[PDB]
From a paper:
We have therefore crystallized BlaC in two different crystal forms. With polyethylene glycol (PEG) 1000 as the precipitant, needle-shaped crystals are obtained with one molecule in the asymmetric unit. The solvent volume as estimated by the CCP4 program “truncate” is on the order of 59% for the shard-shaped crystal, and it is substantially lower (28%) in the needles. When measured by the program Coot, cavities with diameters as wide as 90 Å can be identified in the shards, and only 20-Å voids exist in the needles. The reason for this might be that the enzyme is more tightly packed in the needle crystal form. Since stacking is not observed in crystals that pack in the same way as our needle crystal form, it might be argued that it represents a non-physiological, non-specifically bound substrate that occurs only in the environment in the shard crystals.
BlaC is a broad-spectrum β-lactamase which confers resistance to all classes of β-lactam antibiotics in tuberculosis. BlaC from M. tuberculosis, an Ambler class A β-lactamase, uses a conserved serine to attack the β-lactam ring (blue arrow), thus inactivating the antibiotics. Specifically, we have obtained time-resolved crystallographic data on the binding and cleavage of the third-generation antibiotic ceftriaxone (CEF) in microcrystals of the enzyme β-lactamase from Mycobacterium tuberculosis (BlaC). In our MISC experiment, the small microcrystals were rapidly mixed with CEF “on the fly” using optimized mixing devices, and structures of the reaction of BlaC with CEF were determined by scattering from femtosecond X-ray pulses at five time points (unmixed, and 30 ms, 100 ms, 500 ms, and 2 s after mixing, respectively) during the reaction in both crystal forms.
Author numbering: 29 to 293
Write the structure that this text describes.
Amino acid sequence: DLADRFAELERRYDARLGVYVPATGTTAAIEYRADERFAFCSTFKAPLVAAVLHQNPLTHLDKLITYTSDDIRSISPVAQQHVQTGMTIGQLCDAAIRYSDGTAANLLLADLGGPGGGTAAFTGYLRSLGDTVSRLDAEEPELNRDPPGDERDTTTPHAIALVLQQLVLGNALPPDKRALLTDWMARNTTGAKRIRAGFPADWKVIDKTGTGDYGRANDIAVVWSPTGVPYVVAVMSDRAGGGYDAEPREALLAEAATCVAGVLA
């Protein structure tokens, strides 16, 4: 009945909802618009940190990266406070995952692929994980603003779930690197009202959110049942009918996750 429940969510919230939960050995795949493109918004910062971690020795995380206040062209709660100091790469990975800092992400992009090639190199990193569908094309903030229907800066819940399933559950990062990506997302500050709110509090929830224009509200998560069985949950939504300033409805994501929690019970 999962289709009819998800469709009622789309009726009630006036939204397009995309859900993908990969099949496990015990469970079938839960999928709803799972192969439609949704904007990444800030969800790309999780694989972005993975890409930085993967390409460099843990020594790189202590390289201090300098930037100005004019480099702050986006919501940057943490970077905001060093508009001349500089941060260490590990702290940008931190700010980019936990506070969704936009400046952190732009700097992490530049670290990854240089001044002109950050989004191509990020995209290439996903390609190397077997994701041939996702694309990042702009930096912060333009990547949150592409028109509905535009393929630029989009992923699919299917693609980003499979990517996530390789980063946290798979062997895409060495144990220590994997451990730090898992740490940052589990200490996220932004996801309380989305997938986390839809899952019973003794399931473990690790996530990275994205929010953008056209009512875009995303959460990608790995969750662990009380007995430790891991599931990956990608929930993406937009409310494009309302125009660029349409309000995102976090509660839609929480509800999606509640349905997911009820079939993985």
